[PDB]
Each structure stands twice: as C-alpha cells, then as structure tokens.
Design a protein around this nucleic acid. Structure first.
Ligand code: MG
Length: 65
RNA sequence: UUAAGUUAUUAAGGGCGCACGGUGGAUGCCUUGGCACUAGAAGCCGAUGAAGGACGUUACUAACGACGAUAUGCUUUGGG
C-alpha cells in the first residue's frame, strides 16, 4: 500500500492497518521458518508497507505540533 | 703352435657440449593505488547525546559496503 492511499486513510485506520500488517508479516515469517513460504517477496512488501504507515502517522503527529 | 713386444674394447659412475622438460618469479609491458603540488571552497562536532564503536537489518547471510526494530531502507521535491 502506497503513501497516497495511506494519506486517504484516517489515523485510527492507520493504526488498525499497522496491526494487521504486523500480524501478516509474523505469519509469513512463521511459514518461512516451517518451510511453507514460496512467495518470499511478500515479506519485504509488507515490511515496506508498515514503514510507510508509520511514516505517514509520524508526519501527521508532526504537523499537529 | 710357442715366445717376445704392442695396442684396444669395458663406463659402475663422472666430465664437457647439446636437446627437451620441471621448479622459481627476475625482466618487459600494464594499473586498480600512491607521492608532491596549484587554484577555488571550507576550516569545527557534542547533553536536541559527539568522535569512535557493539549489536542487528536481506528469501537463503560467513564477510565488506549501506542501513537502524520504519534496518540491504520510509516520505517528499526536482533530475532521468
Ligand atoms: Mg520524482
């Protein structure tokens, strides 16, 4: 998910998205450990999505001040 | 046939010459790195936590670079 869609989202929605993305990343890591993950690029995709969500949240709590 | 006399061949190995190999890394050519300077800029960083490090971050990750739990990177503005 890109920064434009994230900026469309609301702050509570960003927090919920961060939670769900973290759960997805964790499940991917567990599948990788057990040898059940073929689509390894998903891990990096989700990690960068989490980074973008946090970046936008930080931008908002900065512009608030 | 006998007698007297003379002189070779031998190369176990060695010497000189030559041919062909091996080792070794001189020499020539080369340069990715140095050395000495010129001109212009700049001449500090740190409790808003420095210099320098440790430990981590990748799909697989021992090491160097980069990066810091937003980790082998995030946003934005321009270039292409
Ligand atoms: Mg651009």
């Amino acid at each position: 998910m890109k920064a434009k869609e994230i900026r469309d989202l609301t702050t509570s929605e960003i927090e919920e998205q961060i939670k769900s993305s973290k759960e997805e990343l964790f499940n991917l890591r567990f599948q990788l450990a057990t040898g059940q993950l073929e689509e390894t690029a998903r891990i990096r995709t989700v990690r960068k999505t989490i980074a973008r969500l946090k970046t936008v949240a930080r931008e908002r709590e900065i512009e608030q001040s």
